[PDB]
Amino acid sequence: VNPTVFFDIAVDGEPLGRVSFELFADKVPKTAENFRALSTGEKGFGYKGSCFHRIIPGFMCQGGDFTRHNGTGGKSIYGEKFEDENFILKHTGPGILSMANAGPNTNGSQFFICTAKTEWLDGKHVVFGKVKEGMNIVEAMERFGSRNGKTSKKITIADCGQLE
Fold first, then answer.
1. Active site includes 70?
2. Which family does it belong to?
3. Active site residue 54
């Protein structure tokens, strides 16, 4: 209805588990569709096989750079960047899915999953989804991150697609 997408996560090739996300297409349609389409890979590029390049324990897990795998790339289905759609939703707690960016109106494909309430990001990053199942898998991923965001194991989206 509002779409659900999943990520199957692997840690150095070993299966960790599945996280699914509800995308708020009712409130942020353009942003939610970009993520949905990048998860199915239906426009010919997307998240399958990419990694979480920056994980900071107690704060958030960030990924979505499928072109340079380090936070300097990625692209949306609308072009290299697109505008901040609205800031209706807030970073209210663990499980919030929001867009990473490089300043106002620079949304591409990078996203982060909050593991804490991060109110200082409200009005700066567009919130568009939430973890539906597998929050415990995000908590497990979190243990491989560090204070500067570097991960001690390669965390990858082994598979991903739509469920609902």
1. no
2. Belongs to the cyclophilin-type PPIase family. PPIase A subfamily.
3. yes
Q: Give the active site residue among 34, 62, 107, 110.
A: 62
Instruction: Find, among 62, 40, 45, the residue nearest to 53 by Cα.
Output: 62
CATH number for the domain that contains residue 157: 2.40.100.10
Sign of CA dihedral 118, 106, 68, 3: positive
Give catalytic status of residue 112 as yes or no: yes
Residue 120 contacts by C-beta under 8 Å, 6 or more apart in sequence?
none
How big is the chain by its Cα radius of gyration, in Å? 14
Experimental approach: X-ray
Total structural domains within the chain: 1
Q: How many angstroms is the resolution?
A: 1.6
The active-site residue out of 54, 89, 110, 144 is 54
Pairing mode, if any, of strands 14-23 and 52-56?
A: unpaired
Mark whether 91 is an active-site residue: no
In this structure, are strands 155-162 and 14-23 parallel, antiparallel, or unpaired?
Answer: unpaired
By residue range, what is the domain housing residue 51? Answer: 1-164
CA separation for the pair 136, 147 (Å, rounded): 20
**Is 23 one of the annotated active-site residues of the chain?**
no
